[PDB]
mmCIF file of C-alpha atoms and ligand atoms in Angstrom:
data_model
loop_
_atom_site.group_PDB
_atom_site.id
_atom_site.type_symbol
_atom_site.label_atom_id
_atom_site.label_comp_id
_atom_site.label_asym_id
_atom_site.label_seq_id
_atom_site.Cartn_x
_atom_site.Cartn_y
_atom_site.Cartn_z
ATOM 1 C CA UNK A 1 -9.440 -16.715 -22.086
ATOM 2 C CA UNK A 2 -12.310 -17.982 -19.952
ATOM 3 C CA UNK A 3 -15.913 -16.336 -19.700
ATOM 4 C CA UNK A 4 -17.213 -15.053 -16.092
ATOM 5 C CA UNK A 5 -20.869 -13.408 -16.334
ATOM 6 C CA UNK A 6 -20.418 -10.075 -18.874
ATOM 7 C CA UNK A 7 -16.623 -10.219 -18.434
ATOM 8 C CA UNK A 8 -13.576 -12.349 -20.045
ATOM 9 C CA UNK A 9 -10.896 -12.914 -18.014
ATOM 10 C CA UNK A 10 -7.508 -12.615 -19.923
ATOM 11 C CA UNK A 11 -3.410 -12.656 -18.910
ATOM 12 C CA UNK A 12 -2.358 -12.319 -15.310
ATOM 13 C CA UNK A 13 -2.048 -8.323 -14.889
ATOM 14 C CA UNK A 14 -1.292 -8.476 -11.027
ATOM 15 C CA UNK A 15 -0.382 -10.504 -7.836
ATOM 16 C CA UNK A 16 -0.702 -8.917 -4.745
ATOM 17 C CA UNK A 17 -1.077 -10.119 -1.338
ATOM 18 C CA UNK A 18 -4.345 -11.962 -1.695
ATOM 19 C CA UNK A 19 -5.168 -13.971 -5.054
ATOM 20 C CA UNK A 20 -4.380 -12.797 -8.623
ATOM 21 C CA UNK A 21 -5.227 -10.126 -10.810
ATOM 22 C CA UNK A 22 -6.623 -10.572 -14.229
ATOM 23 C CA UNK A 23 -7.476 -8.308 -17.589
ATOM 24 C CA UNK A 24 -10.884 -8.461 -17.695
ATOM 25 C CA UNK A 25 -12.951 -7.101 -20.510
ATOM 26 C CA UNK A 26 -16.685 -6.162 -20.022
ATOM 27 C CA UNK A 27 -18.376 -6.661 -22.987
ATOM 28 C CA UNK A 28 -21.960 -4.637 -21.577
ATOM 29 C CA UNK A 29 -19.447 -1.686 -22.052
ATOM 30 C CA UNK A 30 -16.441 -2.426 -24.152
ATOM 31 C CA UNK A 31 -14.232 -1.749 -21.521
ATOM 32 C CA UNK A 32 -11.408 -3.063 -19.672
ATOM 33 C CA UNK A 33 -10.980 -3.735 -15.821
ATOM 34 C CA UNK A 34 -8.606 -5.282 -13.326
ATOM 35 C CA UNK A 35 -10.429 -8.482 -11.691
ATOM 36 C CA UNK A 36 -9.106 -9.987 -8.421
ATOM 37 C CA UNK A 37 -9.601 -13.643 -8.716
ATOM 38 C CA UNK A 38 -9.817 -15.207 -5.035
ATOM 39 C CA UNK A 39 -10.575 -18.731 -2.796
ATOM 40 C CA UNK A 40 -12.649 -18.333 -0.204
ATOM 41 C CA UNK A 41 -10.987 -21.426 1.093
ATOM 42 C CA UNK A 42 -7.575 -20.871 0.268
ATOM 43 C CA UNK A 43 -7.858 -17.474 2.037
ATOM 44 C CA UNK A 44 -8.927 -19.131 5.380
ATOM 45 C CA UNK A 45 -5.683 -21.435 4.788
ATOM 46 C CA UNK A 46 -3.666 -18.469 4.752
ATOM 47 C CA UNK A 47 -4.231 -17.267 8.260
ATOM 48 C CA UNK A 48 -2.572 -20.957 9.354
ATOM 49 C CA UNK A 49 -4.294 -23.742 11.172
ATOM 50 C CA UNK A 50 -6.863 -22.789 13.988
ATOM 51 C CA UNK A 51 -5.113 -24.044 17.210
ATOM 52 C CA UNK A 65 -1.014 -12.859 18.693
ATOM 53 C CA UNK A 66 -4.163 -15.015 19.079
ATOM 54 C CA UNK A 67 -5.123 -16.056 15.485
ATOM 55 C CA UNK A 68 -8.755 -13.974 15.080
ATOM 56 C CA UNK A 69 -11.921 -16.282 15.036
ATOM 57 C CA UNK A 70 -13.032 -15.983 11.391
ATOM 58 C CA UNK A 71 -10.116 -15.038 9.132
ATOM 59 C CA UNK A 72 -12.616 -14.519 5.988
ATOM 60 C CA UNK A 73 -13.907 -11.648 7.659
ATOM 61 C CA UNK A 74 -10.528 -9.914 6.599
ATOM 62 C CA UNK A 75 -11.721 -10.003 2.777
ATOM 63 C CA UNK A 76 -15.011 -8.773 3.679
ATOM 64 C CA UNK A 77 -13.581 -5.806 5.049
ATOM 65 C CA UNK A 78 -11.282 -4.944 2.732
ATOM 66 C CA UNK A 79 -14.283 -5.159 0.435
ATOM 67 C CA UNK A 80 -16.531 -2.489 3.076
ATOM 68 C CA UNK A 81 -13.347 -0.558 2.994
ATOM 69 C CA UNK A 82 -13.128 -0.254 -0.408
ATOM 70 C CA UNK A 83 -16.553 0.725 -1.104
ATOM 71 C CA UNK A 84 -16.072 3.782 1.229
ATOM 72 C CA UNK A 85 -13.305 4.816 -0.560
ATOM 73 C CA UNK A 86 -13.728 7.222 -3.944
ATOM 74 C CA UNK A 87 -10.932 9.328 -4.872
ATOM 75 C CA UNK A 88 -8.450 9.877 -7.267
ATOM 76 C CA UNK A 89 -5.534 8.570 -6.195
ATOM 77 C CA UNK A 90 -7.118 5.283 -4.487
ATOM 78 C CA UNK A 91 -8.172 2.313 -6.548
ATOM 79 C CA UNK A 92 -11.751 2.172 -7.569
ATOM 80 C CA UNK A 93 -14.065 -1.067 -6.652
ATOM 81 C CA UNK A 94 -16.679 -1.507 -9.491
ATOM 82 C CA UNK A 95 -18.592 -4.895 -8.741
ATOM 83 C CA UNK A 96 -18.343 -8.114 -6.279
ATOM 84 C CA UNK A 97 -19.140 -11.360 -7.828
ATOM 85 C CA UNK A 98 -19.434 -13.788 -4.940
ATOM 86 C CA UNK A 99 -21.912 -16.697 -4.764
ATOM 87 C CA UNK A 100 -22.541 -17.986 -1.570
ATOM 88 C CA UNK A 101 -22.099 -21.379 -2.777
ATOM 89 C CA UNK A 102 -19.012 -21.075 -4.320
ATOM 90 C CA UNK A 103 -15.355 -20.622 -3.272
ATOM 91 C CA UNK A 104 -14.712 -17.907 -5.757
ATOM 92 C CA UNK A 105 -15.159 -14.251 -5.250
ATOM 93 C CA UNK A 106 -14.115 -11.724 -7.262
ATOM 94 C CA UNK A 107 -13.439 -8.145 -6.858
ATOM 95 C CA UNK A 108 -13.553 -5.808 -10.310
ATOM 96 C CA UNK A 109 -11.739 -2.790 -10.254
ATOM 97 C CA UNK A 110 -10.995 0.072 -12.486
ATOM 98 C CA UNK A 111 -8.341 -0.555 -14.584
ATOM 99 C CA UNK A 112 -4.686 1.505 -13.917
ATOM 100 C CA UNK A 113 -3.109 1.158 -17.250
ATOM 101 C CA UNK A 114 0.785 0.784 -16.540
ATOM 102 C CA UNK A 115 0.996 -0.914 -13.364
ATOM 103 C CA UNK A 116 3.276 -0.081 -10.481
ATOM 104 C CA UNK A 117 4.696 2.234 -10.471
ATOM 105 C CA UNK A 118 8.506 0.322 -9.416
ATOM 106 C CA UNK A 119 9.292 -2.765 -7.535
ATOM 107 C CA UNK A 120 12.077 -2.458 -5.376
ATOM 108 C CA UNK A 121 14.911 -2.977 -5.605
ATOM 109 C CA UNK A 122 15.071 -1.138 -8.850
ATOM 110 C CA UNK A 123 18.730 0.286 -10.904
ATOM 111 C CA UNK A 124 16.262 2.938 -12.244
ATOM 112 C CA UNK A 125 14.993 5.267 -9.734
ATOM 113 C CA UNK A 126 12.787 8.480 -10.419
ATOM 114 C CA UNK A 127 14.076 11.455 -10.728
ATOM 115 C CA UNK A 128 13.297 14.211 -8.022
ATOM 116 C CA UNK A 129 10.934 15.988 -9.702
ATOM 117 C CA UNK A 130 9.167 12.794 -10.505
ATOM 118 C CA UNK A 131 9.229 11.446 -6.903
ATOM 119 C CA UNK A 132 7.828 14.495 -6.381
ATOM 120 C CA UNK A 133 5.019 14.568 -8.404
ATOM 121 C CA UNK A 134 3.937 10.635 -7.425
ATOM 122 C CA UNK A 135 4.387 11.345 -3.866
ATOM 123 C CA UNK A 136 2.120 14.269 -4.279
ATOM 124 C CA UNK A 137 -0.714 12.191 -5.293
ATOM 125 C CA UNK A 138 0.271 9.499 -2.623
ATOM 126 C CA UNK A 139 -0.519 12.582 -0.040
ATOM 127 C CA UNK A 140 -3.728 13.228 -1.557
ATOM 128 C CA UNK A 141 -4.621 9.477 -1.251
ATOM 129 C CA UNK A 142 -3.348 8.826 2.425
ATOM 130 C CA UNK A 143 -4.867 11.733 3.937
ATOM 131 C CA UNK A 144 -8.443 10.875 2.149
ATOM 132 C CA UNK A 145 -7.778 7.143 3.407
ATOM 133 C CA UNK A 146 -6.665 8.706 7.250
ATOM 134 C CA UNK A 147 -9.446 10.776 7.287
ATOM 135 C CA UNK A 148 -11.961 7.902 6.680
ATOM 136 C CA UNK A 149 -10.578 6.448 9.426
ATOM 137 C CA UNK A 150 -8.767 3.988 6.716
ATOM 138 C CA UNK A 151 -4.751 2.930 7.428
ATOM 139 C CA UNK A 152 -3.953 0.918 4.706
ATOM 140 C CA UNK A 153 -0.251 -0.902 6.114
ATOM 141 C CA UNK A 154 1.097 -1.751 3.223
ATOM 142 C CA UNK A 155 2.382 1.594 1.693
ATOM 143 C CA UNK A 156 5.056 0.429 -0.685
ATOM 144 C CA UNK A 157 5.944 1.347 -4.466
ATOM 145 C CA UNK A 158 4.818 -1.980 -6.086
ATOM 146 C CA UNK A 159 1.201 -1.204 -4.655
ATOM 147 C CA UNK A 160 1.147 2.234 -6.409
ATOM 148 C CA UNK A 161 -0.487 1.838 -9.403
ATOM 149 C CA UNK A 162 0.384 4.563 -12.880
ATOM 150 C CA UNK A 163 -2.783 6.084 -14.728
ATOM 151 C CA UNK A 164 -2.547 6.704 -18.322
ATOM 152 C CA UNK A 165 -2.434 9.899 -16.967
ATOM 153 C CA UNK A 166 0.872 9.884 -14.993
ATOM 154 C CA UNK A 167 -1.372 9.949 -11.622
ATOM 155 C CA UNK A 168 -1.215 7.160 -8.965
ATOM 156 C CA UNK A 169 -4.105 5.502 -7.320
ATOM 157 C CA UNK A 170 -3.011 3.410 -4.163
ATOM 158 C CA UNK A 171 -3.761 -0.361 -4.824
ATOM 159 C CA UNK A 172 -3.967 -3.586 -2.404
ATOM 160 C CA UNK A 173 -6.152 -3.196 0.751
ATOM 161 C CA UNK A 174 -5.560 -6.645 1.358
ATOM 162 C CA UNK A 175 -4.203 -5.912 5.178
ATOM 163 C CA UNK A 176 -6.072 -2.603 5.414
ATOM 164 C CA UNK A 177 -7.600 -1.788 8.965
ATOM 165 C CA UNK A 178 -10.946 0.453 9.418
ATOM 166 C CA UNK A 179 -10.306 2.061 12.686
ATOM 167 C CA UNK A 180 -12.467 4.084 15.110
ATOM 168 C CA UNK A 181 -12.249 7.300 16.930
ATOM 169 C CA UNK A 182 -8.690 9.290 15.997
ATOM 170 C CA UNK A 183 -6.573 6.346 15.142
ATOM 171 C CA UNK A 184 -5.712 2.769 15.559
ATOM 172 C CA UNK A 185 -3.969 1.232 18.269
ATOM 173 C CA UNK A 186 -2.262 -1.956 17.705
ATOM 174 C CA UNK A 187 -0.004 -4.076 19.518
ATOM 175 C CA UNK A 188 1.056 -5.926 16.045
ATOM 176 C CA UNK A 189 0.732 -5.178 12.799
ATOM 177 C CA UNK A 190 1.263 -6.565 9.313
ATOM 178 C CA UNK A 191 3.409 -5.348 6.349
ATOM 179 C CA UNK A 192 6.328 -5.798 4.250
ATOM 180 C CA UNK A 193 9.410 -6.101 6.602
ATOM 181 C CA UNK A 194 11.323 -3.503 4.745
ATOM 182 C CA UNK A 195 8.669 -1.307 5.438
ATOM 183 C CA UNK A 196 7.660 -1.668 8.469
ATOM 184 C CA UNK A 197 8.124 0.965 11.576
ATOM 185 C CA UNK A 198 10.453 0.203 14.455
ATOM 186 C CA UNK A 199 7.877 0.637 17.047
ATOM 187 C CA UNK A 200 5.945 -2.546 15.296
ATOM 188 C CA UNK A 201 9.282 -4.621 15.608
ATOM 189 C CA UNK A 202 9.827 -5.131 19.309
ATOM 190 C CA UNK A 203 8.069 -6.971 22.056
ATOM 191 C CA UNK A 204 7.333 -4.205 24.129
ATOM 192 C CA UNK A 205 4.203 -3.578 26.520
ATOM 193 C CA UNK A 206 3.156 -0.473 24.671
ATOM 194 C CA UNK A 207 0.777 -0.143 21.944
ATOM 195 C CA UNK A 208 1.566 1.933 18.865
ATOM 196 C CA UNK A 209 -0.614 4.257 16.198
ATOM 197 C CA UNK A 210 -1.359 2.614 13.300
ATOM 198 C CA UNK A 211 -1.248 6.434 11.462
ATOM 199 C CA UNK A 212 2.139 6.729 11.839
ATOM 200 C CA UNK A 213 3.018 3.361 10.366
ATOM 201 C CA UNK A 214 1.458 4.524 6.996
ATOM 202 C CA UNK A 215 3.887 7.623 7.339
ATOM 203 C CA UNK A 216 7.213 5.655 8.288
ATOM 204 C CA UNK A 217 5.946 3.346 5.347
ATOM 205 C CA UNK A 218 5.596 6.707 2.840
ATOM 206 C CA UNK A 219 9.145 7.471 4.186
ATOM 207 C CA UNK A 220 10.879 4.633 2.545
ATOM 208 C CA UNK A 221 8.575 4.576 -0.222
ATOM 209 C CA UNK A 222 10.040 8.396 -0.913
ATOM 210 C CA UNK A 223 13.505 6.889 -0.334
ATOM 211 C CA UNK A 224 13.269 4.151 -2.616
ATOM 212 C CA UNK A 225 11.136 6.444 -4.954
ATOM 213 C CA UNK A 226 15.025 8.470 -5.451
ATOM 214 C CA UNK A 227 17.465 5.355 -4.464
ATOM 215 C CA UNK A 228 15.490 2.634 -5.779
ATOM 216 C CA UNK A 229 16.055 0.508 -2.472
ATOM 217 C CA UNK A 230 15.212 0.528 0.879
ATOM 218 C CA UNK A 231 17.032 2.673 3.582
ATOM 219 C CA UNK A 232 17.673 -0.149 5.555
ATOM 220 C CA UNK A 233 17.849 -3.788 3.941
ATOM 221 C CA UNK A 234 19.482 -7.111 4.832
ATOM 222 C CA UNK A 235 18.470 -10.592 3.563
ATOM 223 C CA UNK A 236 18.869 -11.715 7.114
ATOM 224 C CA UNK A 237 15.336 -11.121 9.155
ATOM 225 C CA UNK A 238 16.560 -10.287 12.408
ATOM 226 C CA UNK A 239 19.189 -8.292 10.817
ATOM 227 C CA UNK A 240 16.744 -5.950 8.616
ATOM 228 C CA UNK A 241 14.781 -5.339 11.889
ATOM 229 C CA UNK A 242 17.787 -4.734 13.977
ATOM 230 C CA UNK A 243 18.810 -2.106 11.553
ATOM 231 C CA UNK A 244 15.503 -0.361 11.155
ATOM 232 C CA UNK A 245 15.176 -0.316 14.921
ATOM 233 C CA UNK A 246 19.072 1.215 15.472
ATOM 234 C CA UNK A 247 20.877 1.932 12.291
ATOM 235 C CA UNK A 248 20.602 5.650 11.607
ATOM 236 C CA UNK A 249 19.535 6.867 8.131
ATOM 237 C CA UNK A 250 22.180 7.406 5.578
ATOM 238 C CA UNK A 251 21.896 8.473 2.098
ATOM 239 C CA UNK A 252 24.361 7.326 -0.736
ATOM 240 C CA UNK A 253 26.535 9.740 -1.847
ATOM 241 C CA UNK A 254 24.703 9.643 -5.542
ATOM 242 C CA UNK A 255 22.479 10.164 -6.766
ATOM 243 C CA UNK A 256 22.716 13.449 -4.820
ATOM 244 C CA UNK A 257 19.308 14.673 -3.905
ATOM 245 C CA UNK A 258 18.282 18.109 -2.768
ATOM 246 C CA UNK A 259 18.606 19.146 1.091
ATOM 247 C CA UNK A 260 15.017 19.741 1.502
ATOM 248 C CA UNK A 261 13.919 16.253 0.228
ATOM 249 C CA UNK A 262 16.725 14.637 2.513
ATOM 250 C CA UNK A 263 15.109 16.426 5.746
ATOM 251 C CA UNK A 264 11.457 15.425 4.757
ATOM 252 C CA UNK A 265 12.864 11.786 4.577
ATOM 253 C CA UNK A 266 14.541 12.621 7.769
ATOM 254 C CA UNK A 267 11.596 13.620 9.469
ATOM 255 C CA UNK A 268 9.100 10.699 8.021
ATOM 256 C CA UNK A 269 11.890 7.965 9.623
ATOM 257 C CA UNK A 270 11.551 9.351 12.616
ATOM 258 C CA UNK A 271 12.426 5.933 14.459
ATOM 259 C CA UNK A 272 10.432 8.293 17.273
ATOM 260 C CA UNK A 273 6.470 8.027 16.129
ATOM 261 C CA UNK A 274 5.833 10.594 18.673
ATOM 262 C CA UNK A 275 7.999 12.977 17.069
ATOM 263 C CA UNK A 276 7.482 11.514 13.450
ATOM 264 C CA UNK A 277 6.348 14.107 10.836
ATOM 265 C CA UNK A 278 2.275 13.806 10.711
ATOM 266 C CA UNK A 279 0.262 14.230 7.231
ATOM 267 C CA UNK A 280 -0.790 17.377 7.250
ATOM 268 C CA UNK A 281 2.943 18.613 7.967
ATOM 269 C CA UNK A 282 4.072 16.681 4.829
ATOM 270 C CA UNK A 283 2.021 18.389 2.906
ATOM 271 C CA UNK A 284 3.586 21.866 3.773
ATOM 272 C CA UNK A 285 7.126 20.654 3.692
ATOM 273 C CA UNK A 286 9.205 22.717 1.293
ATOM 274 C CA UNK A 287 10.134 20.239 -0.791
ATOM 275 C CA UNK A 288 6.574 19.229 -1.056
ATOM 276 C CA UNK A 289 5.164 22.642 -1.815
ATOM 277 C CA UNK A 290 8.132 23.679 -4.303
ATOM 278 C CA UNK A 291 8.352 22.720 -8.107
HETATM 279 C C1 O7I B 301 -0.620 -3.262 -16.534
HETATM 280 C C2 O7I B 301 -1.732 -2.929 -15.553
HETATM 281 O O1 O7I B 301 -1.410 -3.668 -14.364
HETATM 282 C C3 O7I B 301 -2.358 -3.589 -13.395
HETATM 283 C C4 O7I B 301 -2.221 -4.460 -12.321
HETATM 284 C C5 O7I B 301 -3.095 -4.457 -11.254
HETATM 285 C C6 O7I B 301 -4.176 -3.594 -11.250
HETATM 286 C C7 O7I B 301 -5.101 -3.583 -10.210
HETATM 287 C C8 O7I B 301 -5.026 -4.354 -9.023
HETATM 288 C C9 O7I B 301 -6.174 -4.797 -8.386
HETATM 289 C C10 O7I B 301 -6.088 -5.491 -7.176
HETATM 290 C C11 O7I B 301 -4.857 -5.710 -6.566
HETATM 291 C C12 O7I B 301 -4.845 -6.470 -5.232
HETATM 292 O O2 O7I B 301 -4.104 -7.464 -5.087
HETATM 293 O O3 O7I B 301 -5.635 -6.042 -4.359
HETATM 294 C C13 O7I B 301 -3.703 -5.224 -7.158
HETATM 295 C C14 O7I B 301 -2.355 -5.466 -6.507
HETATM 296 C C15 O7I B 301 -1.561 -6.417 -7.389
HETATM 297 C C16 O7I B 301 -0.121 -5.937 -7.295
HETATM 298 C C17 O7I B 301 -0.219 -4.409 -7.139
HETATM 299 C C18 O7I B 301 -1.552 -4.156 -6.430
HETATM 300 C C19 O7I B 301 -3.804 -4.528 -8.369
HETATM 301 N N1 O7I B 301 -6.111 -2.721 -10.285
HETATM 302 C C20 O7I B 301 -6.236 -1.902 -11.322
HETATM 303 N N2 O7I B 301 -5.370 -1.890 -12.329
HETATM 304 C C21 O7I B 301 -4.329 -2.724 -12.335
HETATM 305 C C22 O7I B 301 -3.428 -2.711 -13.398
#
């Protein structure tokens, strides 16, 4: 182990987009956190050499995930305890409550969730994207292996690495980031039109809820162009097994929507049948 103010930093619990995660124990409380371990340096690096114009100051992405973070307090989003970050050196660190058994699933899996489980994690994952929507938070990488399992069977959404804080009623982007599998068909073309950074995080909570039941993506290929090609045209098919309820099947439907106009919004979701039944 190694010794960082109150805390000791342990095994490698984590790695997300940004840095690693760490068991840290707190000895001023005898308890046990998650501690992102990052380079200040290293995360300038990452946005590529200054020469889709590359923003100005990449390290200003950190420090916002950090403001965004400190907005956010609910039970189903991760909680931010304590920066450490000296101005004069290239470490910062970002404690976090500790989410005992990890994520939830990292696709592809041979072991998907039953419905009613699906059902009972996606519940919470509506409770945590409407409190981060209506914060003005879209957080762009919804996927299962950034779901994080309680001791108590909840989930708390994890990795605000690529999170945007947006004004007014939603975001409008021209590009976006996120895992390919997961990412919207209006955010894979070059087109002149600018898309709603809202309905990304649904699309993405589609084929989280797909791969939640089927333990893989909807649409998948190893070949780039080919994986956007088919989320852009391929229509949705489920297997023939497992064989999942109707309802669930048309709230899947309705999330990949390749249409974000028509797409199924939030508040819908949450008074979808299969949603609202047990
Ligand atoms: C066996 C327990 O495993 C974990 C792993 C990561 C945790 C994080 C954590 C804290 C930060 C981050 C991050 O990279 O911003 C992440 C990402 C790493 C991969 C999944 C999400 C996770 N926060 C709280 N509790 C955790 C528990």
């Amino acid at each position: 182990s190694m010794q960082l103010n109150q805390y000791t930093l342990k095994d490698e619990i984590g790695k997300g987009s940004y840095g690693v995660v760490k068991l840290a124990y707190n000895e001023n409380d005898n308890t046990y956190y998650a501690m992102k371990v990052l380079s200040k340096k290293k995360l300038i690096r990452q946005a590529g050499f200054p020469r889709c114009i590359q923003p100005r100051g990449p390290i200003e992405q950190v420090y916002q995930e950090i403001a965004i973070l400190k907005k956010l307090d609910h039970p189903n989003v991760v909680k931010l305890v304590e920066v450490l970050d000296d101005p004069n050196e290239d470490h910062l660190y970002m404690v976090f409550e500790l989410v005992n058994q990890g994520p939830v699933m990292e696709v592809p899996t041979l072991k998907p969730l039953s419905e009613d489980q699906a059902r009972f994690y996606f519940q919470d994952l509506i409770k945590g994207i409407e409190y981060l929507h209506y914060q003005k938070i879209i957080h762009r990488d919804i996927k299962p292996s950034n779901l994080l399992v309680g001791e108590d069977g909840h989930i708390k959404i994890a990795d605000f690495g690529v999170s945007n804080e947006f004004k007014g009623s939603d975001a409008l982007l021209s590009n976006t980031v996120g895992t390919p599998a997961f990412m919207a068909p209006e955010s894979l073309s070059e087109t002149r039109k600018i898309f709603s950074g809202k309905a990304l995080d649904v699309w993405a909570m589609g084929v989280t809820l797909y791969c939640f039941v089927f333990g893989q993506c909807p649409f998948m290929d190893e070949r780039i162009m080919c994986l956007h090609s088919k989320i852009k045209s391929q229509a949705l098919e489920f297997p023939d097994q497992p064989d999942i309820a109707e309802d669930l099947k048309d709230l899947i439907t309705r999330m990949l929507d390749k249409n974000p106009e028509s797409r199924i919004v939030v508040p819908e979701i949450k008074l979808h049948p299969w949603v609202t039944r047990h």
